Amino acid sequence: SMNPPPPETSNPNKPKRQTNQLQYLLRVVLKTLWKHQFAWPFQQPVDAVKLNLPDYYKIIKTPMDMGTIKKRLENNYYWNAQECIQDFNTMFTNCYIYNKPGDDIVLMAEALEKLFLQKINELPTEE
Numbered sequence: 001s002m003n004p005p006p007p008e009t010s011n012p013n014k015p016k017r018q019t020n021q022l023q024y025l026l027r028v029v030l031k032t033l034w035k036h037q038f039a040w041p042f043q044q045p046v047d048a049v050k051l052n053l054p055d056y057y058k059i060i061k062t063p064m065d066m067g068t069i070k071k072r073l074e075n076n077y078y079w080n081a082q083e084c085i086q087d088f089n090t091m092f093t094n095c096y097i098y099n100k101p102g103d104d105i106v107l108m109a110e111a112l113e114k115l116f117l118q119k120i121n122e123l124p125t126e127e
């Protein structure tokens with residue numbers, strides 16, 4: 001029932017670059033969701049022990065959270081913008097898999113995902 005180690009956030013064996021899309025992903029997308037009233041449950045890995053979720057890591061094999069995404073962006077862990085977009089999508093999908101329609105956390109994830117999609121709509125073009 002213990003938690004796994006958190007996802008990696010710093011990659012020493014990978015080159016680094018600054019693109020307009022990565023700048024938007026941190027400055028607009030991540031920062032807009034991070035400041036939202038509903039952000040706390042998504043700001044660090046799910047602590048299944050503290051929250052009394054013993055089957056969480058039996059069901060969710062690709063955990064992801066915004067604290068991880070934020071550190072990945074700040075650390076230039078991503079080379080392609082799509083790597084970051086897929087991490088946001090994984091985070092929302094995990095919430096939907098584990099929880100039920102009508103659960104408060106699901107409504108919160110749905111509101112954050114709608115906001116994510118509104119901001120992704122204006123992602124700049126690839127170089």
Ligand SMILES: COc1ccc(CCc2nc3cc(-c4c(C)noc4C)ccc3n2CCN2CCOCC2)cc1
Nearest residue numbers: 040041042046047049050051052053094095098099105
């Ligand atoms: C006692 O252990 C903790 C552990 C983490 C946190 C951070 C906030 C938090 N993190 C959460 C993750 C989830 C969640 C996600 C995300 N995916 O599935 C589940 C299920 C749901 C709710 C969460 N909440 C608020 C929970 N409430 C209000 C705070 O006291 C506990 C009850 C607070 C307390």
